[PDB]
Each structure stands twice: as C-alpha cells, then as structure tokens.
Design a protein around this ligand. Structure first.
Ligand SMILES: *[C@@H](C(=O)O)[C@H](O)C(=O)N[C@@H](CC(C)C)C(=O)NCCC(C)C
Length: 212
C-alpha cells in the first residue's frame, strides 16, 4: 500500500459540491464512492445523483439525515441516474427514478470497513474512495480553512464525508460544503494519533460499494 494515495490525481473524483441547507450529507458521501468505483472499473468518470438517494432511500430521512450504507444499498439493488438527468434541488420530493428512464449505473453490493482500525481504513482507501463519518458540529471544524486538522473535536459523529486519499500523517477528505471551505473544499485530518476512534471519531463507521 503506498505512502501516498490521492484519487483526484488518477481522475476518480468529481468537482466539490455544496449540500446547502439540507442534511443530505449521507447522499453526497455515498455518491463520492459510486463515482469513484465506476471510474475505477470502466475508465469513465461520471457525475451521479445525490437528489435521487435523497428522494428514494425510504430508510433514511431526506434533508435532516440518513445513512450512506442504506444509500449504497439502493444502487446495488436498483441503480442510480446521472446527476445531469436527476439534479440536486436540496429539497426532498417524490422518488422519480421511474420518470427518468433506465439507470445509468448499477453497483453490485456493499461492504463495511472494520471499525476503529486505522490500518483497515487505510487499506480500503488504497483500493477506492470510501464513505466515512466524523464530528463536524464543533467550530474549529467549521472554521477550518487550509491545514493538518488535529481538532479539537469530540467523537459524536454527525456528518458523513468521503475519504479520497491519505499521507504519512493524514487522511484526505472531500467535504460537501462549497469549494470555499477548508482546502478548495477538502480537509486533511491527522492520522496515527493511535486513538481507536480516530480524530473527531473518524473510524466510527466506513463503507464502500463493490462492483464488477
Ligand atoms: C450530515 C450533514 O451535515 O448533512 C447529516 O446531518 C447526517 O446524516 N447526520 C446524521 C447521520 C445519520 C444518522 C443521519 C445524524 O443523524 N446526525 C447525528 C449523527 C449521529 C446520530 C450522532
């Protein structure tokens, strides 16, 4: 597993988005991983629909949260539409998958990373972008604007994001705040603290899709 991984370099991550005033972090998280995995297999980099997860994941709660695992669970069964064809509106509405033609993509299943093990998280990110959670409500986090982030922060995770890289000292994360946040929309969180939870509770719950 190399000392460095950055999926952006191998053209596996799309531009950073802004979730706005809706708690659809869980959907944005899920989409980073789908978009990653499809490009890893097919060589194509496509933009996929956050809005659709938002509208169709019964099991989550639209704006004001849900679960990326649930979310990844739906593309495996059904599929997902391109972001062009099912645009983000930042409001939950009816599920219109149907109205929009055949799926653009389908995934083959979902897997969870062994929790509270840096090693296991690092291994997965070596293979493809992964869905992860952390505690984002503290003001140090919100105020971040470039930097190796070591907190302060607690372990009460409340915000799903995606890990798209790592270094000797950090894990790379794509946030769903604008491009105006942290590092052009990214955050480098310090690793190897040797805390099992991870900084801000980073190792609490990670998932990635499986495809052919
Ligand atoms: C993340 C975002 O800021 O959009 C979003 O609020 C979210 O999904 N939050 C939740 C995680 C899922 C359980 C919904 C949420 O529940 N908030 C508290 C998280 C844990 C229960 C502490």
């Amino acid at each position: 597993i190399p000392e460095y991984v950055d999926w952006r370099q191998k053209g596996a991550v799309t531009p950073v988005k802004n979730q706005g005033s809706c708690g659809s972090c869980w959907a944005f998280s899920a989409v980073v991983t789908i978009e990653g995995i499809i490009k890893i297999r097919t060589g194509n980099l496509n933009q996929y629909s956050e809005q659709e997860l938002l509208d169709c994941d019964r099991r989550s709660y639209g704006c004001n949260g849900g679960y990326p695992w649930s979310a990844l669970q739906l593309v495996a069964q059904y599929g997902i539409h391109y972001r062009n064809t099912y645009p983000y509106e930042g409001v939950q509405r009816y599920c219109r998958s149907r109205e929009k033609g055949p799926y653009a993509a389908k995934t083959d299943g979902v897997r969870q990373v062994q929790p509270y093990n840096q090693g296991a998280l690092l291994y997965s990110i070596a293979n493809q972008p992964v869905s992860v959670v952390l505690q984002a409500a503290g003001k140090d986090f919100q105020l971040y604007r470039g930097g190796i982030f070591v907190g302060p922060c607690g372990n009460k995770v409340d915000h799903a994001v995606a890990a798209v890289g790592y270094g000797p000292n950090y894990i790379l994360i794509k946030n769903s705040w604008g491009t105006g946040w942290g590092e052009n929309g990214y955050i480098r969180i310090k690793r190897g603290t040797g805390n099992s939870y991870g900084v801000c509770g980073l190792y609490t719950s990670s998932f990635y899709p499986v495809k052919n």
